[PDB]
Design a protein around this ligand. Structure first.
Ligand SMILES: NC(=O)C1=CN([C@@H]2O[C@H](COP(=O)(O)OP(=O)(O)OC[C@H]3O[C@@H](n4cnc5c(N)ncnc54)[C@H](OP(=O)(O)O)[C@@H]3O)[C@@H](O)[C@H]2O)C=CC1
Ligand SMILES: NC(=O)C1=CN([C@@H]2O[C@H](COP(=O)(O)OP(=O)(O)OC[C@H]3O[C@@H](n4cnc5c(N)ncnc54)[C@H](OP(=O)(O)O)[C@@H]3O)[C@@H](O)[C@H]2O)C=CC1
Ligand SMILES: CCc1nc(N)nc(N)c1C#CCc1cc(OC)c(OC)c(OC)c1
Ligand SMILES: CCc1nc(N)nc(N)c1C#CCc1cc(OC)c(OC)c(OC)c1
Lengths: 166, 166
């Protein structure tokens, strides 16, 4: 609408939409992370404050934008926004931005998502944090591929990309 | 028109519109069945008498409505209707109803379909029962996604959803 960048979600979730456990990731898939790095590289990452602090460091090659209500919050090598609109202001001339989680930030940007890069992990983890439900009416799957399952990547998972039609 | 529920078709068919063989399903896709259960949950299932009897049991979490000309027909845990209009009476205040087959019941409700949930299986099965032809002009595809193909689900198939424009 009023904003001009493509708003993409980047997320990995399990069979029951779990994305987190005890303020961390419930699984380790190095190959899935490499897919994430390659796809997001050169584009802003929009992160909830909690998500960012668990990561602990600016992710290289991308604008790191942290979303917080804390008006005195500052991190070296990162930009801080306090609302959806402030993100939109900081990113006004960007081609595409990646909403990178976690759940509160996914909920925040849900009315604006144009494109969904969702990895689906075929396992039911114990967890406390969930990706929001989405009505996929007027969305089309434009990419799907099986993830690498091996000794280092011990679950079955698929990369999916959906694009909003309206 | 005069009825106020959305009339949805729920069907799985192959390359030649085959839906049945010898009064049963020509394939076993448990993942497709999982999609069907999730999509139809909480909404009425409208089933031809033959379709229902092959299933043999009320499907849980949904109003089971059986269409038959047999005026003395009764099944515990299900409702019986004898015409399209009687189904519309039973479902007058429903949000959406799912025409669940088989072919005679799809034929019956064809003039009233608003929405199509079609699974397309990329294989040509031997069969005797077919989904009726439909002119898709004035229909828009509002969702498409690849189904899961694996050891338990040995065919390639896609979920499609179409909505009628008029
Ligand atoms: N599997 C996956 O794809 C991913 C998993 N995760 C997981 O998710 C979990 C973290 O998610 P979650 O707990 O939801 O936290 P978030 O990352 O969503 O961060 C929540 C914080 O965001 C800020 N915030 C929330 N709403 C607003 C608002 N309206 N305006 C301004 N700031 C706001 C607040 O910061 P403040 O308190 O400073 O005001 C809040 O504490 C972790 O387990 C993490 O590992 C995260 C990303 C991806
Ligand atoms: N792949 C898929 O998506 C699906 C496949 N199927 C398959 O389809 C086949 C069954 O289809 P089909 O043989 O056409 O049978 P139906 O399920 O459509 O049942 C036909 C019965 O419906 C009743 N009926 C038909 N017309 C009317 C009417 N105008 N008024 C009142 N009742 C009516 C009659 O009941 P009565 O004789 O009692 O009077 C008739 O015998 C099976 O092979 C099944 O596995 C079924 C559903 C889905
Ligand atoms: C699970 C991966 C992931 N996959 C996908 N498809 N989208 C995402 N948004 C994320 C994510 C995330 C958050 C996240 C990323 C990380 O590496 C960059 C982390 O370092 C190891 C991390 O440590 C706590 C937490
Ligand atoms: C093939 C599935 C199916 N898929 C879709 N997309 N729509 C449908 N309307 C049906 C259907 C049907 C009929 C049907 C359902 C069943 O499980 C609930 C059955 O039990 C195993 C069954 O056994 C004889 C017959």
């Amino acid at each position: 609408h009023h904003h001009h960048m493509r708003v993409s979600f980047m997320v990995a979730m399990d069979e029951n939409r779990v994305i987190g456990k005890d303020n961390n990731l419930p699984w380790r898939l190095p190959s899935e992370l490499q897919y994430v790095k390659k796809t997001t590289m050169g584009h802003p990452l929009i992160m909830g404050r909690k998500n960012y602090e668990a990561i602990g460091r600016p992710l290289p090659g991308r604008r790191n934008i942290i979303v917080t209500r804390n008006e005195g919050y500052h991190v070296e090598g990162c930009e801080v926004a306090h609302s959806v609109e402030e993100v939109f202001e900081l990113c006004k001339n960007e081609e595409e931005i990646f909403i990178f989680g976690g759940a509160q930030i996914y909920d925040l940007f849900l009315p604006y998502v144009d494109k969904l890069y969702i990895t689906k992990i075929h396992h039911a983890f114990e967890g406390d944090t969930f990706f929001p439900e989405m009505d996929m009416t007027n969305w089309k799957e434009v990419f799907v591929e099986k993830g690498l399952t091996d000794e280092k990547n011990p679950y079955t998972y698929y990369y999916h990309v959906y694009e909003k039609q309206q």
